[PDB]
Design a binder for this molecule. Structure first.
Ligand SMILES: CC1=C(/C=C/C(C)=C/C=C/C(C)=C/C=C/C=C(C)/C=C/C=C(C)/C=C/C2=C(C)C(=O)CCC2(C)C)C(C)(C)CCC1=O
Length: 139
């Protein structure tokens, strides 16, 4: 559908830009099955990593790097993968994961994507995020 043009547009951004956009999408939310327990499990592991390790782990998930953790994430359902990304972002907010650069100004090319997405349907907006995270991890 149209969500394809978005996911591909999103994927055609820098790895550090993609994270930045995903992050702001999360902030704009507060101002086939899913298995939640498994998702928090992976998160717990990531929580043990230091901040650098936690950033690279996210860069790795996008770049499809072959980690021991990238493999765990790859073996998850599409719906639980998204839940896991929410746990990371929530984690950053709760000081338990690498905080976002205060000085990071978002590019205007992603400021557009942010706006276009906000105008999307709730169902679609969900499918967009779900379609974005599934093509990640290893294997
Ligand atoms: C520090 C630093 C940085 C790093 C920045 C970093 C680390 C940025 C990381 C940003 C992160 C972790 C963004 C995550 C966003 C998650 C979203 C929007 C979740 C949507 C979930 C939904 C819609 C729920 C869906 C669903 C779920 C799951 C269910 O399970 C059932 C409900 C429902 C169906 C609705 C930079 C790269 C910027 C610079 C370098 C540098 O130093």
């Amino acid at each position: 559908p149209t969500i394809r043009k978005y996911v591909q547009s999103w994927q055609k951004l820098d790895v550090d830009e993609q994270l930045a956009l995903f992050w702001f999408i999360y902030k704009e939310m507060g101002g086939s099955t899913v298995s939640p327990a498994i998702a928090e499990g992976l998160f717990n592991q990531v929580k043990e990593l230091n901040h650098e390790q936690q950033l690279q782990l996210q860069r790795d998930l996008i770049r499809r790097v072959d980690n021991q953790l990238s493999r765990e994430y790859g073996s998850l359902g599409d719906t639980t993968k998204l839940l896991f990304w929410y746990l990371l972002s929530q984690g950053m907010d709760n000081a338990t994961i690498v905080p976002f650069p205060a000085d990071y100004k978002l590019s205007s090319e992603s400021q557009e994507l942010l706006e276009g997405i906000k105008g999307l349907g709730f169902e679609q907006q969900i499918t967009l995020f779900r379609d974005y995270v599934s093509p990640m991890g290893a294997e």
